[PDB]
Amino acid sequence: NAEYLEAKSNALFLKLRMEELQVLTDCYTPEKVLVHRQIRDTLEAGVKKEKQELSTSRQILSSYEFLGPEFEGLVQEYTRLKDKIKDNRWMLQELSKSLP
Amino acid sequence: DLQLKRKMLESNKLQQIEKQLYVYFFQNEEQLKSIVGKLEAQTGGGSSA
Amino acid sequence: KEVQATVMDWWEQPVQLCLPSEERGGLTLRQWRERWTVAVTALQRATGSRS
Amino acid sequence: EIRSQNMKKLKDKSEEYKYKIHAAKDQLSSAGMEEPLTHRSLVSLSETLTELKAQSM
């Protein structure tokens, strides 16, 4: 009984493995493999370019962050004021077009 | 599950070609235009300029 | 479970959506697939062939 | 006694499977298929590029 159960377990495992390998042979034909290679090369070139840009930008931001919280408050205020001026100008332009 | 999906690819030739479309896209643009154009011409549409 | 995952990859072919901005013949792959799907659907409508 | 007979059939089938698995491994190698060229590996690589553009913006 012990021998029989062992033989049954081994046969089921080998069937499963055979069927897996047959599916992989159907999926990756030489033509497709070539395409997958082209796609890789484009993706790899993109990953490399973006990793370099991220590294340069992170280096510049680190120089401003060194001028303290007070500067950041000033920058926030400046930015708020520029945004309000831009909104008011935008409102004046829209009232002139309506003089029928 | 494998027997059902293999059968599905052997019966439907149009689905097989669909699955090959990305291959044509990266290897042969002319073929891609041709394969998609042949399928569009067969469909009569009178384009006005 | 691993074999089931492999069967799934074979059926979906996910590698076709990995480069969206690539244009060939002035159109993206998606656009081409869409064109294909519209054409296949038009052919199926003409050819009474109710799928 | 029935199980002993069935065990003989199972051993023969196991030998048949081992033979088909070798033949399939040989066909994949001739097609130049490497691990990084798989759907799963390439998707994984595209997902990494999107993540990096988001970090750069």
Author numbering:
A (entry chain C): 254 to 353
B (entry chain B): 549 to 597
C (entry chain D): 616 to 666
D (entry chain A): 173 to 229
Task: Quote the authors verbatim.
In mitosis, the augmin complex binds to spindle microtubules to recruit the γ-tubulin ring complex (γ-TuRC), the principal microtubule nucleator, for the formation of branched microtubules. The elongated structure of the augmin complex is characterised by extensive coiled-coil segments and comprises two structural elements with distinct but complementary functions in γ-TuRC and microtubule binding, linked by a flexible hinge. The augmin complex is recruited to microtubules via a composite microtubule binding site comprising a positively charged unordered extension and two calponin homology domains. By acting as an elongated structural scaffold, augmin positions the γ-TuRC on the pre-existing microtubule in a partially flexible manner, allowing the γ-TuRC to nucleate a branched microtubule in an approximate orientation with respect to the mother microtubule.
Since expression of the isolated TII tetramer is reportedly inefficient and structural characterisation by negative stain EM analysis failed, we opted for co-expression of all eight augmin subunits to reconstitute the augmin holocomplex. We subjected the negatively stained augmin particles to 3D classification to obtain a 3D reconstruction of the augmin holocomplex in a defined conformational state, in which the TIII tetramer could be unambiguously identified. The remaining density clearly reflected the clamp-like overall shape of the predicted TII tetramer models and the hammerhead-like region formed by the N-termini of TII HAUS proteins was recapitulated in the density, allowing us to confidently determine the orientation of TII in the 3D reconstruction. The approximate placement of the predicted TII tetramer into the negative stain 3D class indicated an interaction between the TIII H3/H5-arm and the TII C-clamp. Guided by these insights into the overall organisation of the augmin holocomplex, we used AlphaFold-Multimer to predict the structure of the TIII H3/H5-arm in combination with the TII tetramer. In all predicted models, the TII C-clamp interacts with the periphery of the TIII H3/H5-arm in a manner that is fully compatible with the negative stain 3D reconstruction of the augmin holocomplex, as judged by seamless fit of the composite TIII tetramer-TII C-clamp model into the EM density, thus providing an accurate model for the interface between the TII and TIII tetramers. We thus individually docked the TII N-clamp as a rigid body into the remaining density segments guided by the orientation of the N-clamp HH. Merging the TII N-clamp with the model for the TII C-clamp in complex with TIII, we generated a model for the complete augmin holocomplex. The N-clamp is linked to the TII C-clamp by a hinge region, which allows for an opening and closing motion of the TII clamp, as suggested by the ensemble of predicted models.
